[PDB]
Design a protein around this ligand. Sequence first.
Ligand SMILES: [Zn+2]
Ligand SMILES: [Zn+2]
Lengths: 146, 192, 321, 243, 49, 8, 97, 209, 114
Amino acid sequence: RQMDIIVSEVSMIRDIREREIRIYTDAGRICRPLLIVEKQKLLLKKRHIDQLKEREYNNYSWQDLVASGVVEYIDTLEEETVMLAMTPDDLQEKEVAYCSTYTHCEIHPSMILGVCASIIPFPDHNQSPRNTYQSAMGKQAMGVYI
Amino acid sequence: NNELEPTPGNTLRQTFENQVNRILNDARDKTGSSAQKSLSEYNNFKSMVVSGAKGSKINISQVIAVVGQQNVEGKRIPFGFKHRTLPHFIKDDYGPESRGFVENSYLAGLTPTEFFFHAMGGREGLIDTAVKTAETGYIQRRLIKSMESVMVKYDATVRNSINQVVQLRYGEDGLAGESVEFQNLATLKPSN
Amino acid sequence: FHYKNVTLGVPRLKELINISKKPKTPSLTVFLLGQSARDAERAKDILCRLEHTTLRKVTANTAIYYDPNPQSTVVAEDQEWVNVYYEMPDFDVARISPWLLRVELDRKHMTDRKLTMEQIAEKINAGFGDDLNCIFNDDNAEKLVLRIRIMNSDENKMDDDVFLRCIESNMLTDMTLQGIEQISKVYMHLPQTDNKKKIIITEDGEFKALQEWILETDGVSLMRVLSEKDVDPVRTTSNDIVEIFTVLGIEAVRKALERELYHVISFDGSYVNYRHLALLCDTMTCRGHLMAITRHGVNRQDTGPLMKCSFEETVDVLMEA
Amino acid sequence: IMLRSTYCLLNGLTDRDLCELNECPLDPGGYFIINGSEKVLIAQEKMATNTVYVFAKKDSKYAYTGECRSCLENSSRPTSTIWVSMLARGGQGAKKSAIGQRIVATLPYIKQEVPIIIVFRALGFVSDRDILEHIIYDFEDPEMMEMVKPSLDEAFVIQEQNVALNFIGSRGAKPGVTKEKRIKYAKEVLQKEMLPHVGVSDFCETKKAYFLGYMVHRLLLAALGRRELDDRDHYGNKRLDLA
Amino acid sequence: YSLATGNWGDQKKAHQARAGVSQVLNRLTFASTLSHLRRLNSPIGRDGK
Amino acid sequence: IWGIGCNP
Amino acid sequence: DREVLRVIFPTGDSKVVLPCNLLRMIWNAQKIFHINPRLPSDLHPIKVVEGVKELSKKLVIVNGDDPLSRQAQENATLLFNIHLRSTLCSRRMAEEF
Amino acid sequence: DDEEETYRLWKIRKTIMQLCHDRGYLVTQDELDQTLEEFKAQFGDKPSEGRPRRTDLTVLVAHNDDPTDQMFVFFPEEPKVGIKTIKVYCQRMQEENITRALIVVQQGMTPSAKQSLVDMAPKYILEQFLQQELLINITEHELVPEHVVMTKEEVTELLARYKLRENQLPRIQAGDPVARYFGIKRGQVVKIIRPSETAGRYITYRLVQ
Amino acid sequence: VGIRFCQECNNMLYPKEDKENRILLYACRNCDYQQEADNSCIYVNKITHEVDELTQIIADVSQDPTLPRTEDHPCQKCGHKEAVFFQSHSARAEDAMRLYYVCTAPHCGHRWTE
DNA sequence: ACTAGTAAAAGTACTTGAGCTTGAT
RNA sequence: CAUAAAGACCAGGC
DNA sequence: ATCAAGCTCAAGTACTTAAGCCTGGTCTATACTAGT
Ligand SMILES: [Zn+2]
Ligand SMILES: [Zn+2]
């Protein structure tokens, strides 16, 4: 987390039943960032937001957000020992508890789409072959290219 | 609670998923009827489904009431991780939410863990159309090369290219399929 | 994917268009004649009488002990019934072989098939030889045990530990207590549509549908099934057309083939005319045998050399010609 | 040179400098220029290396194959794959019925298969107690010891290290004429291409004994039904090839 | 050479090589370009079913 | 996308 | 031939494909000649009998005069003549049609 | 045991009685509707060490339109049959002067005996059946239509009033169980009468070779 | 049922037959070492496959944040009121939808099914 | 040095291999 | 009028 | 009592096969050796 020895691209998988620990520093893996959850609250406080809308004259950016221990890169093998909460305002409250021991949290759940599928308005209302049709058709729409 | 007795021909997994698919498939046709009986006379979906030009009665139910339940490889959405479907759920969960029952509609929008599943189902339905055409277009060549010279001769007999007889009269009656209709005999059926 | 297991659509069409000797899911629909067709339990022991039962389906465990004399019995309970056998001991003519085999039986799978230790021990003795000795309990007890010894008339290389484990792992898989060996699982249902019911002209002259019990298998062997009692020999059919070509004839493959094409066309509610199915099934079976619609059926015909070269084997047909 | 990278003549500029050179400020880079046209390298998928896999192919007498695509840390022109299979139950024979399934191995540059205890006895470790404390890790489970017993009772007659290297080294691409060429080729293949990612130096074959005991131990876990099989389409079993 | 023509190998072995790597950049619209620079590929053959 | 008996 | 249809069709159906639709062809003739179905009619029934016989002779599939080329004529035009004498008989056309 | 075996012997015997009834021979009606109890009281109860031996089950029948033509039905004792038993039966046929014969084989043949059945072709034609094959009459089945063997004049009006040659007919090989049910050699035309749903009845022809 | 090794060359011991005292002996096919039988049996072949999961689940599985938890089932040995449940995750999927419970109090690890 | 020779199932078709029956003895 | 070869791979349209 | 002759059934090892039509693009003719 706080970057003493280990570069942030390794993955450290512990499967409890198999009784082994795998550590990967190999190249070629694919990963995406997430937000750490403590006991039940997040770690991204408002102290990290009010000095992040000031990037042009503060020298505070994403690397100070990684080096503070509030986001973290997770890859695909380590997404099988994880317990995500998809949104904080609705899934980490005191309710009829589905799970009570979340370990991560997503940024926004619409970051699972690519470049040609982020130009479709309201994709959660369409039939998904139509999304696949337009995700190969905004590649041949005449416009200004450069 | 180890209280579910299996059925003749099935395992425990098969009787479990068959009666869960029974419950959920009987509770999306009900919502379909609640959508069908709540339209109007000036409506235009209903004015297309009735007239027969375009549309069907499951599209009105998916647009208005419930999209349904997706399935890849002919069964409900599988455990693609170990004991989970996506990393949001808990291990060995078998409920309707965890495995693909899309309970919203196309107008109320889809939640993320549900739009992903609907993308899986639409993906399978796109692969099948992408693949099937080569096999069908190969069969339809192999038949047409195997039968290409069978024809009706001037004796009303249906002979080969080597003139060796295939049928003595065409279609076992002698008639061409352009000018026949459905009829009823009405002598075999009634009482004595 | 959405509908037992029966292939439909395209792969069953390309199983019927050639004559593929291993169809991907063959079956054998079984009708019944007498009192067995109406009552469920006599249909249940026709069901037991057709489906194959190997010995390992009715076993619990097999444990090789070492009793040099049958009066020792290191097994902590079994001195009672071999003491009943010890009231009059039999077959101690050559020696006593010490190496023993011991099978426990599971009474759910046993009483499910109306079997007992007397006809199992009749089968595994009369049928294998006299090389073994099969003693067993009484049906009063809960556990079902049968002790097996090798015959002493060889001991008066062939080490009997390796040999006795060899017959232990041969009797579990190759014993065939009941049934036909090609038929692996038989179902049981009575139909709802009228195409598998029994349609009778009544006394007044009215077509009546009657519900009947039918069995339907996973695996085809028609000639042994037609030859079985309380089975209708008139109406029993199948879907493996090379097996109907083996058993019934050539006209039966014309008509069963016509019925199979009509079965795959009319499952999606479509309709193709009859002249076309009669022409295909009447060209495919015209010269006596099953002219498959492939390379190897049409390219072995009396058609000329300049017709076979436009179908898949141009230069080879031209050079043999 | 890939454009906009650190060894390009456009890195770290501002917008007026990029517009002055007739370049676009938005154009993201990440492409080459060869003979005027502009190429781009597509990242090619790959199966992961140095991980032990168990599958089950329904074709042959092999009922459970293991794999390990091995690479010696970004320096290998081939990739040395070592399988450890397990034979069928339904092999038609009046002897194997009481014997059982035998564990084999398909080493690189050796076309015919070799049984396992011969390969372990080519690495030293002549006793059977030591070979079965490398291949299974506890001595109170009676099921997992019976599962490997025909693999021991096949290789009883080759019970010397040097005739084991003659046995393994006898079937190469072309067999040797004398014996010491065969123990030469067997020792260099069985030490230099048996598992390059573990160790290349001529000592420490103990670590190849522990890792091959782990591979066959994993085959015995996935044969006794105590674990699932590995999934080919699992996207944690993939790697990607960029520029 | 092997960037210029795609065939990821030698010139004298130009038929035992995995083609389709290092292809021409696409310039209709700017998101065509951003999609082409972010693209994965699996080497399973494209006639299997 | 509908159900098990329908379409995907 | 009522008893022949019960062994050609053992199941019980009656939807059979044939040539020219006969109910539509008697229902056109009820309007080309303005048939009042309320009066007594002037069709004497032994014009019906020899009408159906002389038409049923003029329907030749196999042109032949000798035997074995005259019995296949009666196997070809068999189901249509059962249907023809079934629909166009004496009671059913003096009463209903 | 023995009740299943005498059930088999009754059902085989009844099958052979319809078989030679269909080939055109003289069969009394009493042995066609022969119930199991009349068999069981006539020939014996059990064949296990018993009175129906597989000997004294043999049947000699005679043709209708000619009293000379007879056919013998042999039930061999041993499971697989060699050449020596075929020489025994052929010896009995030699001294009794009968041409046609059937051999209902219990378990199977040996191929030199089968070559010893195809080699005496112009005289002493023997036919080989199997116990497992004769437990059901295949002519009464749902799928199998009516076959009628055609005499030579009728073949002349077929090949003369369609203006065909003889090879231009459809064919059938003489190894299917129906042309072995009727005992048909190469050169003979079978007539098949089957009911169809387009015309009502269709008569087609087949040349056996 | 188990396995037997030698005390000189450390290889596999086999059962053998010597025809004097009617006693099963284990011997070695390498050296000349003999010892008698203690159990007087060889082979056990469990066809029923009724192995119990309570000797194959680990007490460490309560340290897993991706498994469900229950207040309603207390433990018996320690009285702790928190547990974690899971299914078979193993072979024999004949009727395998039971529910194994593991106590989550540290240094207890008590395991029970219902 | 310049420039021209230059080395995925799935059906069938064919081969070997083991064992049988039979005349000889 | 006449002449613009030809092969291999790739990205697409219905 | 074994001994070839002739034959049948089974398994092992190659060859042959995968929709139609249409429109644009870039690259390449061999790198290496002896005549001349
Ligand atoms: Zn030892
Ligand atoms: Zn506890």
